[PDB]
Design a protein around this nucleic acid. Structure first.
Ligand SMILES: [Mg+2]
Ligand SMILES: [Mg+2]
Ligand SMILES: [Mg+2]
Ligand SMILES: [Mg+2]
Ligand SMILES: [Mg+2]
Ligand SMILES: [Mg+2]
Ligand SMILES: [Mg+2]
Ligand SMILES: [Mg+2]
Ligand SMILES: [Mg+2]
Ligand SMILES: [Mg+2]
Ligand SMILES: [Mg+2]
Ligand SMILES: [Mg+2]
Ligand SMILES: [Mg+2]
Ligand SMILES: [Mg+2]
Ligand SMILES: [Mg+2]
Ligand SMILES: [Mg+2]
Ligand SMILES: [Mg+2]
Ligand SMILES: [Mg+2]
Ligand SMILES: [Mg+2]
Ligand SMILES: [Mg+2]
Ligand SMILES: [Mg+2]
Ligand SMILES: [Mg+2]
Ligand SMILES: [Mg+2]
Ligand SMILES: [Mg+2]
Ligand SMILES: [Mg+2]
Ligand SMILES: [Mg+2]
Ligand SMILES: [Mg+2]
Ligand SMILES: [Mg+2]
Ligand SMILES: [Mg+2]
Ligand SMILES: [Mg+2]
Ligand SMILES: [Mg+2]
Ligand SMILES: [Mg+2]
Ligand SMILES: [Mg+2]
Ligand SMILES: [Mg+2]
Ligand SMILES: [Mg+2]
Ligand SMILES: [Mg+2]
Ligand SMILES: [Mg+2]
Ligand SMILES: [Mg+2]
Ligand SMILES: [Mg+2]
Ligand SMILES: [Mg+2]
Ligand SMILES: [Mg+2]
Lengths: 80, 157, 121, 129, 82, 205
RNA sequence: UAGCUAGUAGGUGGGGUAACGGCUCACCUAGGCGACGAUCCCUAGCUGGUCUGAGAGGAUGACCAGCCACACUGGAACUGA
RNA sequence: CCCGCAGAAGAAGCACCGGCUAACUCCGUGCCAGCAGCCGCGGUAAUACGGAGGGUGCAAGCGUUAAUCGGAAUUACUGGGCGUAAAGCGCACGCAGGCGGUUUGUUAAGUCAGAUGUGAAAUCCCCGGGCUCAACCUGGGAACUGCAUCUGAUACUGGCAA
């Protein structure tokens, strides 16, 4: 299979572009506690499809601006 | 099977109407070399009178200790007052690596090879009570098998 | 203590400072020297202790205790300085090395002559 | 506000043994029964029940071989503020294998001795000296 | 150009040549893809002395890589059937 | 490298016979043994825990003729090796060539055996060897070359080996001055007096 | 050191690059980064490793080896895979 | 590398010696001169100063200085505390943040389990081989506590549920 990192949408005010905050629950090297850490990206999309506050699948792809080197595969569980 | 030795001897004052009157405080330990240990404090006006007084307390105050061949069963803390203390079973090789005072109470007991470190304060009186707190609390599989109403092989194996 | 408290603010290691600003992990250091003089020490000692206001090569100005019985220093004279507090004179935190450069050895010292820079008979 | 019930279960056992008391009642759960069934099956607790149908209540009946208590010492390890999980080889053996660590594995809650023979690891709930 | 060549390791006056596959531009003891045995000219008539993995040479030379003046002699030394 | 001083003084400090000034004569009784280390020999030592450990190490050094830098490296080797660390130390000390040559009988004293090794007299498996610290592995055949063989500092010294205990682990021909180191030295065979336990303590800290 | 940022953030079109891309002009759009530390300030080549420690770590990155960066200081292109 | 040649021939210091820390006396000096890593020694019988003989530990090195860790559980995750020793904000309300009673689902993020490639070579650790021996060199293996994906387990953590 191909890559598909899950992540929740933060904003869409960019036109054919989005900002996604991927969540990851990795532990601290020293102390052992599992911390709720963020991986903030930008992603491409043909037209402003996704809105705000919803889970999204994302693929590693060709660079298509400065930053923003990720493509939207599809939406899963759309906004309320 | 006597085996007895001195740990420390400390000089202490009283202070009276006249001047001050010094007395010495010995600290001896005894043990057969087979899981019977006793410490005795003792205190007198003279140094040789103090250790002979100290040796009489230790002989009567023995404590039974179970042990595997010539070492501990399991790792054990043994806090007392300031000295927290710690000791670990270790292998058939090696020797008794521990601090002064803490090693005396070990070597005379019967143990031939353990790890040990004296955390917190390392006062000669308390570290001896610390080790013997730990060694008295320590237990063998033959005790625990009977305690849990089961079997020696099933628990261990 | 408290593990989450340490994630938010890690353990600040106690940075123990070096006693001697001769600096750059240097063993010794030169000094052109000024004011060779004498000072009375702390309470329980009482004496006249020899000392010179050394002017180090790296810019600092220090006081160095001159060991041994009798010395060559006077006003100037270029001297090598090692580390080592005296624990007697308040503030004198260096020792003038004997033998090295202009501070010559003490006369007639048979015992202990690596210290004090003296040769065999 | 009773954050961890599993720690609280083990304190009632610990303070129960110090007090010299037979019955020790508390609120029940799925995990409380699973821990208790390990301790009975091994041998720290002579029997237990979970009476009350609608609002459950778990009472234990504690063991004393001599006047001294059977439970020497008992400690929560993977507390909710700091969770701990261990590999197959890294499962700790308490008291050099005469004292057990209750571990929540993928195939139910079990002892650390069973997890070696099973060939797996998991969340170490509590040590029992 | 990838080349099978001697690296020269060891002590002063007592050399030990690690025969190795590396790029020509890269240094004598520089990078390499992987080694392929060793050479030692100070063994004498005893148990061990020289080694050369014949399968790995068929991979690199079959693809495209030169064999240096000394390593050319070691392929002759091991022989085909002699 | 060596002590090269008053040898029999070192026997008085420790007390026991170190086999330094043994030679053709059997027993000394010609030095006021035991009760005269230096000037103040009438004094008696209190001796702390550091003392008893140090005196044991100092004794085992002077018996075999080893200095502390070399001795500390022998300890580190014993720590690596398997089994009991104490018995490994004495196994390595006995494995020296100058010590094996002394046990054979080719050398009345240990300093004689050390110099006899150094001066190209001692051969082993056909190879001439000049090093005292040569670590002798088991199943060897030490021997003297025909130049140094049957000279007037060997035949006299070999007669002393009749009086000596004669170890079990090695064999001697005593016809053509030939030796055969058979196996490694065990603890129970030799020593039976000098303590190994106290030296292992000193270096562990 | 609390707010920074105007080719700044994103689009459509033209150019340019061995190649994608504000790499660069042209509109269009007013976003992007930031308490999970942007900006600013000081210090610093990084890594394999090295030293130390029972270990977790702590210090460090001479020598051997991988990567980057520089070549009197500042700048620019040319010739070439 | 080997052989012969001549002949005790050419070839030992330098710290320390009151306690911590192995090792003592005698003269000289008299809070002076000086020592010292800490405690501290010296005021006319100094084991601490200077010298002398003796001793101790190192020895082709030895001390001194600086530097890093260690001991220091004296930044404590393993592994400390906070009534009076340093340390509970003067007291509330509360946003982000952390943490969360309990039952039945699903769930594959944590989690664990396996699989695959990668974790450059040296260095380290184990066993061998070679310099007469050792440093040094070197063969093999483990190690490279990891990392990414893939397939599961589904108790405990989390989501969306009832
Ligand atoms: Mg992970
Ligand atoms: Mg770019
Ligand atoms: Mg005291
Ligand atoms: Mg006292
Ligand atoms: Mg080179
Ligand atoms: Mg070529
Ligand atoms: Mg040497
Ligand atoms: Mg915005
Ligand atoms: Mg430590
Ligand atoms: Mg350089
Ligand atoms: Mg790059
Ligand atoms: Mg230029
Ligand atoms: Mg061109
Ligand atoms: Mg002195
Ligand atoms: Mg006098
Ligand atoms: Mg002195
Ligand atoms: Mg620490
Ligand atoms: Mg504290
Ligand atoms: Mg406390
Ligand atoms: Mg107060
Ligand atoms: Mg207070
Ligand atoms: Mg208050
Ligand atoms: Mg505050
Ligand atoms: Mg309040
Ligand atoms: Mg409140
Ligand atoms: Mg809140
Ligand atoms: Mg939550
Ligand atoms: Mg819950
Ligand atoms: Mg599934
Ligand atoms: Mg795994
Ligand atoms: Mg790579
Ligand atoms: Mg490697
Ligand atoms: Mg090695
Ligand atoms: Mg190797
Ligand atoms: Mg190899
Ligand atoms: Mg290989
Ligand atoms: Mg990972
Ligand atoms: Mg992964
Ligand atoms: Mg399936
Ligand atoms: Mg399922
Ligand atoms: Mg759940």
């Amino acid at each position: 299979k191909i890559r598909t990192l899950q992540g929740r949408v933060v904003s869409d005010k960019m036109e054919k572009s989005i900002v996604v905050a991927i969540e990851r629950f990795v532990k601290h090297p020293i102390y052992g506690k599992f911390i709720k850490r963020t991986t903030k990206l930008h992603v491409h999309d043909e037209n402003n499809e996704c809105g705000i506050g919803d889970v999204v699948e994302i693929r590693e792809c060709r660079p298509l601006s400065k930053t923003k080197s990720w493509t939207l595969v599809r939406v899963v569980e759309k906004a309320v | 099977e006597l085996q007895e030795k001195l740990i420390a001897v400390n000089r202490v004052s009283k202070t009276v109407k006249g001047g001050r009157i010094f007395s010495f405080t010995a600290l001896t330990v005894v043990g057969d070399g087979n899981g019977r240990v006793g410490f005795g404090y003792g205190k007198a006006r003279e140094v040789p009178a103090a250790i002979q007084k100290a040796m009489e307390k230790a002989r009567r105050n023995m404590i039974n200790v179970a042990l595997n061949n010539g070492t501990l069963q399991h790792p054990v803390k043994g806090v007392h007052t300031g000295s927290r203390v710690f000791m670990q079973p270790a292998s058939e090789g090696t020797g008794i690596i521990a601090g002064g005072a803490m090693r005396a109470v070990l070597e005379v007991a019967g143990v031939h090879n353990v790890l040990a470190k004296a955390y917190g304060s390392t006062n000669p009186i308390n570290v001896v009570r610390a080790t013997i707190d730990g060694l008295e609390n320590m237990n063998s599989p033959e005790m625990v098998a009977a305690k849990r109403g089961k079997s020696v092989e099933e628990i261990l194996g | 203590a408290t593990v989450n408290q340490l994630v938010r603010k890690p353990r600040a290691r106690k940075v123990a400072k070096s006693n001697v600003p001769a600096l750059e992990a240097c063993p010794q250091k030169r000094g052109v020297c000024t004011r060779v003089y004498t000072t009375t020490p702390k309470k329980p000692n009482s004496a006249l202790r020899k000392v010179c206001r050394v002017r180090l090569t790296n810019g600092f100005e220090v006081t160095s205790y001159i060991g041994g019985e009798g010395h060559n220093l006077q006003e100037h004279s270029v001297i090598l300085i090692r580390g080592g507090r005296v624990k007697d004179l308040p503030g004198v935190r260096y020792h003038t090395v004997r033998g090295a450069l202009d501070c010559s050895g003490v006369k007639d010292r048979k015992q202990a002559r690596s210290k004090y820079g003296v040769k065999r008979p | 506000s009773m954050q961890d019930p599993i720690a609280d279960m083990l304190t009632r056992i610990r303070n129960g043994q110090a007090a010299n008391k037979a019955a020790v009642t508390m609120p029940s759960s799925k995990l409380k029964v699973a821990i208790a069934n390990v301790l009975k099956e091994e041998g720290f607790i002579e029997d237990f029940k979970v009476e009350g149908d609608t609002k459950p209540e778990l009472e234990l009946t504690l063991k004393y071989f001599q006047g001294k208590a059977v439970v020497e010492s008992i400690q929560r390890v993977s507390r909710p503020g700091l969770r701990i999980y261990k590999r197959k080889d890294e499962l700790p053996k308490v008291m050099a294998g005469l004292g057990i660590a209750v571990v929540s594995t993928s195939k139910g809650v079990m002892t650390d001795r069973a997890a070696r023979q099973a060939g797996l690891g998991g969340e170490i709930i509590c040590y029992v000296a | 150009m990838v080349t099978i060549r001697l690296a020269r390791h060891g002590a002063k006056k007592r050399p030990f040549y690690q025969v190795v596959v590396a790029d020509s531009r890269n240094a004598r003891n520089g990078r390499f893809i992987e080694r392929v045995g060793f050479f030692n000219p100070i063994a004498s008539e005893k148990e061990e002395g020289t080694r050369l993995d014949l399968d790995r040479i068929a991979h690199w030379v079959g693809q495209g890589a030169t064999i240096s003046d000394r390593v050319a002699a070691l392929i002759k030394e091991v022989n085909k059937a002699a | 490298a060596r002590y090269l001083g008053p040898k029999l003084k070192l026997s008085r400090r420790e007390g026991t016979d170190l086999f330094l000034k043994s030679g053709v004569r059997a027993i000394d009784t010609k030095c006021k043994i035991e009760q005269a280390p230096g000037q103040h020999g009438a004094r008696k030592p209190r001796l702390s825990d550091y003392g008893v450990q140090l005196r044991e190490k100092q004794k085992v050094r002077r018996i075999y003729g080893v200095l502390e830098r070399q001795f500390r490296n022998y300890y580190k080797e014993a720590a690596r090796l398997k089994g009991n660390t104490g018995e490994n130390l004495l196994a390595l000390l006995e494995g020296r060539l100058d010590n094996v040559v002394y046990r054979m009988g080719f050398g009345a004293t240990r300093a004689e055996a050390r110099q006899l090794v150094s001066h190209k007299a001692i051969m082993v498996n056909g190879r001439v060897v000049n090093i005292a610290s040569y670590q002798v592995s088991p199943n060897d055949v030490v021997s003297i070359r025909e130049k140094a063989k049957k000279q007037s500092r060997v035949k006299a010294a070999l007669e002393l080996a009749e009086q000596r205990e004669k170890p079990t682990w090695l064999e001697v021909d005593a016809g053509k001055m030939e030796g055969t180191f058979k196996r490694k030295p065990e603890r129970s065979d030799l020593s039976a007096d000098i303590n190994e336990h106290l030296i292992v303590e000193l270096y562990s800290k």
